Amino acid sequence: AVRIKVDTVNAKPGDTVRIPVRFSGIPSKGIANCDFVYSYDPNVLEIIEIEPGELIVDPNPTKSFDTAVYPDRKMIVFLFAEDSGTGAYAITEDGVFATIVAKVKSGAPNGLSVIKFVEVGGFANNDLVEQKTQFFDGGVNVG
Amino acid sequence: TDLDAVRIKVDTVNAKPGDTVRIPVRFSGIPSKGIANCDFVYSYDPNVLEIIEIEPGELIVDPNPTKSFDTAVYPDRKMIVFLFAEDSGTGAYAITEDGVFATIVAKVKSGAPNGLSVIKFVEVGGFANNDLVEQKTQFFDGGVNVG
């Protein structure tokens, strides 16, 4: 199974923090596409940007990777679909899939603001066979 | 209806339990300038409708439609996410006319109850013209009137 984990990072109100989303157990046949959703607390974290991680091998990262943030529904949607169409830009190793850049609101309480796994859609290898996954939560420990 | 807004509306189609139905998502009031990108979410009842595929509509002009258009269906959370961003980078594949943005293809489950199974607007992210200026939008619901 591929393991997906959002880091838990420490920050102080006002800080702009980077929260890696890591993949481990990436199969030999790679990951051609994957999409999933995590929830967050928009009253504590303002999502600034979500950067393609080192695992995105496409020369034009944004062609293979995208995210959509919906503050009202409190969700972050991750979308990866290797752009070559031949499997060429498939993820082939463990590492950082994306980096959430979020600002901790100035009046945020101390303690953990959770970034929780909500749902996975597809998560397939270069044979387009669905892979088993195990998703883990993360967030920001405000101090 | 705001004539200065782009109105997005999911059709309300009639069907019987067991039918595979096509439910267009239409755009009206598209600025001649063109829409370079848009993303939004509608909810549905996966206990009545099994989403089979969401086809790029006639408005998706990219010769590689999947490079400009994508959707994500989440049955557990009961949501459908629509994502459009013209792939050329120069505005070449922007949406420039009124018409079908996408087509939801769904099967009405054999045991589905009679009545309207609503496909309801949830939230809009961006909806920008070619100069990257956010456009005023109005989203309307649709669904399948099961009978």
SS3 sequence of chain A: CEEEEECEEEECCCCEEEEEEEEECCCCCCECEEEEEEECCCCCEEEEEEEECCCCCCCCHHHHEEEEEECCCCEEEEEEECCCCCCCCCECCCEEEEEEEEEECCCCCCEEEEEEEEEEEEEECCCCCECCEEEECEEEEEC
Write down the experimental method used for this entry.
X-ray
Is B1-147 CATH 3.90.1150.10?
no
Q: Which residue of B has its CA nearest to A118?
A: B77
Between CA A108 and CA A44 the distance in angstroms is: 5
CA geometry: angle B144, B65, A78, nearest 5 deg: 75
Would you call B83 and A66 a contact, using CB atoms and an 8 Å cutoff?
yes
CA torsion, points A89, A67, B60, B144, in degrees to nearest 10?
Answer: 120
Phi first, then psi: give them for residue A83, nearest 5 degrees. -70, -20
For β-strands A2-6 and A16-24, DSSP reports them as antiparallel
Q: What resolution (Å)?
A: 1.7
Phi first, then psi: give them for residue A63, nearest 5 degrees. -80, -25
Between CA A11 and CA B104 the distance in angstroms is: 43
Residue with tokens 């067991």: B18
N-term to C-term CA, chain A: 34
Between CA B49 and CA B27 the distance in angstroms is: 23
Q: Which CATH class is domain A1-143?
A: mainly beta
Largest Cα separation within chain B, whole Å, is 48
| Chain A partners within 8 Å of B121 (Cβ) | none
Largest Cα separation within chain A, whole Å, is 48
Q: Residue B68's closest CA among B99, B119, B102? A: B102
Q: Residue A115's closest CA among A90, A88, A137, A143? A: A137
Check if the beta carbon of residue B42 is closer than 8 Å to that of residue B79: yes
Q: Which residue of A has its CA nearest to B43?
A: A73
A110: number of Cβ within 10 Å: 9
Domain assignments of chain A as residue spans, ordered by start: 1-143
Residue of A33, A34, A35 best to disrupt the B interface, most CBs of B under 10 A: A35
Check if the beta carbon of residue B13 is closer than 8 Å to that of residue B21: yes
| Chain A partners within 8 Å of B54 (Cβ) | none
B53 shares contact with chain A (CB less than 8 Å): no
Would you call A35 and B72 a contact, using CB atoms and an 8 Å cutoff?
yes
Between CA A23 and CA A135 the distance in angstroms is: 9
Q: Which member of A68, A81, A121 has the closest CB to residue B39?
A: A68
Check if the beta carbon of residue A101 is closer than 8 Å to that of residue A51: yes
Q: Residues 6 or more apart from B127 whose CB is under 8 A from it?
A: B6, B35, B37, B38, B39, B40, B134, B135, B137
A59 shares contact with chain B (CB less than 8 Å): no
CA torsion, points B52, B85, A59, A35, in degrees to nearest 10?
Answer: -30
DSSP structure string for chain B: --TTSEEEEE-EEEE-TT-EEEEEEEEES--TT-EEEEEEEEE--TTTEEEEEEEE-TT---SSHHHHEEEEEETTTTEEEEEEE-TTSSSTT-B-SSEEEEEEEEEE-TTPPSEEEEEEEEEEEEEEETT-PBPPEEEE-EEEEE-
Q: Residue B8's closest CA among B75, B106, B112, B100? A: B100
Count CB pairs under 8 A between chains A and B.
40
Q: Residue A13's closest CA among A139, A102, A106, A140? A: A106
The residue count for chain B: 147
Burial code (b: 16+ CB inside 10 Å, e: under 16) for A23-51 equals: beebbebbbbbbbbbbbbbbebbebeebb
Check if the beta carbon of residue B30 is closer than 8 Å to that of residue B6: yes
Q: Residues 6 or more apart from A109 whose CB is under 8 A from it?
A: A44, A142
Check if the beta carbon of residue A53 is closer than 8 Å to that of residue A80: no
Residue A112's Cβ-count burial label (10 Å; 0-12, 13-18, 19+) is middle
Between CA B111 and CA B109 the distance in angstroms is: 5
Residue with tokens 């929780």: A116
Between CA A115 and CA A138 the distance in angstroms is: 5
Q: Residue B45's closest CA among B135, B132, B146, B126? A: B146
A93 shares contact with chain B (CB less than 8 Å): no
Between CA B117 and CA B123 the distance in angstroms is: 19
Check if the beta carbon of residue A110 is closer than 8 Å to that of residue A142: yes
Check if the beta carbon of residue B130 is closer than 8 Å to that of residue B36: yes
- The C-alpha of B69 sits at a distance from chain A's nearest C-alpha, in angstroms, of 11
